[PDB]
Design a protein around this ligand. Sequence first.
Ligand SMILES: C[S@@+](CC[C@H](N)C(=O)[O-])C[C@H]1O[C@@H](n2cnc3c(N)ncnc32)[C@H](O)[C@@H]1O
Length: 198
Amino acid sequence: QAFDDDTLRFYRGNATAYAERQPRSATLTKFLGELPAGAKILELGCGAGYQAEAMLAAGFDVDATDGSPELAAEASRRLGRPVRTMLFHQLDAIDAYDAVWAHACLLHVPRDELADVLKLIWRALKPGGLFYASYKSGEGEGRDKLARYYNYPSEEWLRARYAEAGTWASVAVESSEGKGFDQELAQFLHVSVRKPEL
Ligand SMILES: C[S@@+](CC[C@H](N)C(=O)[O-])C[C@H]1O[C@@H](n2cnc3c(N)ncnc32)[C@H](O)[C@@H]1O
């Protein structure tokens, strides 16, 4: 399957504690700066909704979603708006979003299913749309002490999967250094791609 059960089970049993941590906004600010005001944005794996809240306040039309009903519930309370429950592989929209934001969530997709998920995102994006996704880098898939699955890919592996998923007009990648929820130091790869213009 395109999702890991124990990963989702972790978020559904630790939603209160996890909802207390706010993600860094550096890459979000850069992302929004590359979009027109009021852009239509789909957020995948929105978690507690901190970033969806920021995007909405910034004037964007955000369709926030998360695979965990528990976290989606927390996000809906924070946003005062509907945060729907949706697993990545359930996406089936076509040319509906100017951009897609997926912060530290597609890293939970089983390696063999990532390309297919990226293809769904390609289809959901409008021509010329921007898609950002961050991943925890590594040299092989694994699972942390909290039972969360990570695809732990290299930039080269990610680029190969993105190329198989579809034709991208451009692919930009930058890295950052930060501590994960498990308090372990980790490197994150931020992939920003553009869907070809009409
Ligand atoms: C590390 S959290 C990041 C939440 C957020 N974007 C942030 O940076 O705070 C990983 C997110 O991916 C979501 N999740 C895990 N598996 C997923 C799946 N297969 N479909 C969609 N959501 C999923 C989890 O519920 C969780 O909210």
